[PDB]
Symmetry: D2
Subunit: 260 residues, 4 copies
C-alpha cells in the first residue's frame, strides 16, 4: 500500500483494540480504515474512537470482508480461533496481518506459516519494542557477565495475575540460561559460572515491571522494562505494520527491530 497505510483493527472494542486505535492515530504514516467486532458486540455502529476521544469516521463493524477490502493490514490481538478466520480472509484479499494473539498450539502455528507464503505477517509473542530489545541485549550481557555474577529476574505484576513468573520473565530467564550455555531451572567467585534466580511481587494494579539484575562484589547492572499501559504493545504492533508493508513472508519482532 501507499502511505498512509490503511489499518484495520480486530477486537476493536477490547482493551487491546482501543489502544491500537490510539496507536494508529499517533503514527503519522498510518490511518484507521476499519474496526472489527463480532455480531454481539454492544459497540457495533459506534465510532472506533468513541472510548478514547477520537473521531475516526470508522463505524465498528462485523463485516469482515468489507473492512478487509478497504484495508492494507489487519492488526489482531484477539483469540486464536477468530484470528485464524481473519487470517484466511487476509490471504484471500491480499491484506498483511500483525498477529499479537497468543495461545496457538502446533496446528495454529502451522496455519500462520502457511499463510506467510501468500501475505506479509508479523507474528510475535510480545509486541513491546522495549521488551524485545531487552531480550536481545540480555544475551550480550549474560555472555560478558558469564562468571562471577548472581543473576536475578525480578518482576512486579497486578495482584490477581495467575502465572508466576510471567511469560516475559521466563523468556528473560531462557535467554540468559541460553547465553550461559545452560538449561533453565554460597559466594560466587570471579571464575565461578554466574547463577540465575527469580523473584515475584504481586500487588495493586501494576501493569508489569521486569528487571534483570546482575550482581557481583562492588557492582550491580540492572536492565529494566516498565510497562505504563497497553500502549507499549500497541505502538510496537503499529511499527510492525509499517515495517512489513510491501513484504511477503513470516517475520517476528527481531526482524522489525533489525536485530540478530
Amino acid at each position: 500500500g501507499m502511505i498512509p497505510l490503511k489499518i484495520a483493527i480486530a477486537g476493536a472494542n477490547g482493551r487491546m483494540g482501543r489502544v491500537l486505535v490510539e496507536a494508529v492515530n499517533n503514527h503519522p504514516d498510518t490511518v484507521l480504515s476499519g474496526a472489527l467486532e463480532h455480531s454481539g458486540s454492544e459497540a457495533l455502529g459506534l465510532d472506533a474512537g468513541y472510548a478514547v476521544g477520537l473521531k475516526t469516521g470508522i463505524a465498528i463493524s462485523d463485516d469482515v470482508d468489507a473492512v478487509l477490502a478497504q484495508s492494507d493490514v489487519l492488526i489482531d490481538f484477539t483469540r486464536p480461533e477468530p484470528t485464524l478466520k481473519h487470517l484466511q480472509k487476509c490471504v484471500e484479499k491480499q491484506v498483511n496481518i500483525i498477529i499479537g494473539t497468543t495461545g496457538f498450539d502446533d496446528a495454529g502455528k502451522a496455519a500462520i506459516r502457511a499463510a506467510a507464503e501468500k501475505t506479509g505477517i508479523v507474528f510475535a509473542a510480545n509486541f513491546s519494542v522495549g521488551v524485545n530489545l531487552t531480550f536481545h541485549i540480555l544475551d550480550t550481557v549474560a555472555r560478558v557477565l558469564n562468571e562471577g555474577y548472581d543473576i536475578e529476574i525480578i518482576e512486579g505484576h497486578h495482584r490477581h495475575k495467575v502465572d508466576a513468573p510471567s511469560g516475559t520473565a521466563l523468556r528473560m530467564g531462557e535467554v540468559i540460561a541460553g547465553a550461559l550455555g545452560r538449561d533453565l531451572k554460597g559466594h560466587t567467585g570471579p571464575r565461578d559460572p554466574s547463577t540465575i534466580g527469580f523473584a515475584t511481587v504481586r500487588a495493586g494494579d501494576i501493569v508489569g515491571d521486569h528487571t534483570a539484575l546482575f550482581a557481583t562484589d562492588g557492582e550491580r547492572v540492572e536492565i529494566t522494562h516498565k510497562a505504563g499501559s497497553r500502549m507499549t504493545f500497541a505502538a510496537g504492533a503499529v511499527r510492525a505494520a509499517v515495517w512489513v508493508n510491501g513484504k511477503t513472508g513470516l517475520y517476528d519482532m527481531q526482524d522489525v527491530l533489525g536485530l540478530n
Copy 2:
C-alpha cells in the same frame, strides 16, 4: 562528661570497630580515647585508625580497666559474653555503654536492665538512624493505608546471607501487621483489609536494601532504606553516645531519635 565526649570502642579491630573509629572521628563533639581488643589480637599496639587512614594516638589495647578509666562511654558491637564483662566494668567505673551487640537471651537482657539503674545505656537491635525511622513511619503508613492496599516487604542482601527474610525485614513486617491489628504470617478492594507479603533477593555483596511497598489501583507508595556500608550503624551508635551523655537509665533508638 564535658564535650568533647571521650569514646572508647570495643572490638576495635573488627569490621564494626573500624567504622566506629571513623564515626567518632567524623562527629565534632566526640574524640577517641580507647580502642579495645582481646589479648590474641594481631593488632595490639597498633594505632586504632591504622586501617582507616587516621592517626588517633590511641594504641589498640587489651587493658580494659585502663581504657575505661579514661573514657566517658564505651561503644560495643562484639559478642554477648565479652560485652557483659565490659558492662560490669562500665558500671564500676561509671562509664556509659552503647550496646549494639545482638543475640542476648532473657538472662543477658536482665543483666543490661540491672546495670541501667547505675549507668547510661542505649541498647538497640539496630543502630541505623534511617532504619529506626523507617520502623516508626511504617506504623503511620500502615494505619492510613489499612484497607485496599497490597503490602510487600522486599529486601536485597549479599549472596551468602543465611536468614531470609532478614531481621530488619521481619521487624518491618511486625510493625505493619501490628498497625493492621493482625499477627505476622484475589483483588484487594477499597474496603478490604490490606494484605502483607515478603520478597527476597540474594546476590553479589549487597549490604542491605529494604523496601516496604504499599500498592493499590493507580498508586504505589514505597518506603526504602539503602545501607551503603556499616557506617550507618556506626554513625547512629555515636549519635546515641552523644544523646545519652549525662543520663542514667535504659534507652533505645526510639528515645535517641525523639520518637513515640
Copy 3:
C-alpha cells in the same frame, strides 16, 4: 445520606470524570446517581460509564438541579467558575461537595469557606491518599534527619509538562524546609543542618513519580510516590465523600486521613 451514598460526578466526560465513575463503581459503599456535563458536550445522553465498560444506568445530563436533587454528594474536578456555580446549588439542595478543582484565588477560597458553614466540603490541592500521606511523613522524617543529610526532591513527569518542579514536588520541599526551620530556596557533617535540592526528569508519558531522598555517609532513605493513572486522585476523592458523610464544615485530606 444512608449507605449506599449516592454520588454525582461533574465533568463526567473529562479525564478525571471517567476515572471517578470507575472509583464510585469500585467502592462498595457508594453508587453513581448523576453525571454532569455542560450543554455542548458530545456525550449528553450517553451512559456515564460508556467509555470505561460499565453500565451505570445514569445518562450524562446537563440538568444540574435534577441531578443534585437525587444525590448526596457531588465530586467536582473541573474549573473554578463552573465549580462555584455547582457549589451554590449544593448549598441550596443540602448536597456535600468534594472540590478537587484547583486554581482558585483568594475570592474563590472565601466562597468555599462560606458554603462550608452550610454543607460538608472536602477541599484539597491533592486527593491522592499516598501523596497526602507522604507530605505528612516527610515532616517527621525531616525533623529526625535534620542534621547531616543531603535532601533531594526528585521527580519524573511526561515530556510536555510545563511546571518544573511540579506542585507536588514544591509542596514536598515546603514541608521539608518547614520541618528544618527554614524557608524554601561541600560535605554535610553530622552536626551540619541538612540541605535541600531538586531534580527533574521530563520524558515520555510518565504520570508522575516523586521521591524524597535523604542521604548521608553510609545510608539513603527514600520516600517515594508513584502514580500509575488518575485513579489515585479519584479513589481518594471517593474516600473523602464517604468520610464527610453526615458532616458540615470545611475539611481537607489531612482530616480525611486522620492525620495531625
Copy 4:
C-alpha cells in the same frame, strides 16, 4: 607468565591500591608478588594487606626494579607522572601493565602507544566491567529506540563531587548521541528523532549510580549501573591482567570483554 599470574600493585597504600590487593586475592588465577609505594609512604615495610585483613607476605616496598623483576604484570591507578616512570621499567623488564591512571594528555598517550609495541598493555578510562558493558549496549539500544523516545542520563554521586555530569555520564551521552547520528549538546511522536537530556543528584557518599532512561508513551527502558565500592574497577583491572597475559600490544576494555 605461567598461572598463577604474579601481580604487582602500584600505589598500594591508596584507595585503589587496597582494593586491588583484595581483587588479586579473590581471583584464583592470580597472586600478589609486589606492592609499591613512593619513599615517603608511612606504609613502607607493612604487609600489603595490612588494612584489608590479609596476610600476603608482601612488604610494601619502594624498590621498583626489585618488584618488577619478580612480577608478570603491574596494575597502576596512580598519577600520570609516576605511571610513566613505571611504564619505562615494565618495558625494560618485559612486564605487562594495566593503566587505570587517568588524566594523560596527547604526549602521555603517545608514550603508552609506543611502549605497547614492546609489552602488553590494557589502557582504559574505566575498568568497571559493568560500565564498559553499559557503554556497549547503549549503542544498540539507542539505534533501535532512535525515534519516539525521550532519553535521560541520570546520575547520583557523593556531595562534594566537582564534575557534573560525571565522565561516565558524558560518555554514556556521547555513545547515545553517536548512535543517533548526532553531536552531544514538546511531545516526541513515533517518527520524531529521540532526544537526550541529563539529570544530576549530589548527596551523601553515593559511590556512583548511572541510569540511561529511554521513555515513550506506555514504556520505560532503563539501563542502570550501580557502583557499591571501588571493587568494581579493581576486579575489572584484574580481569584485564589475566586477559592480556601472553600478549603484546595496546588494548582496551572492549577488547578484554570481547566486544565490538
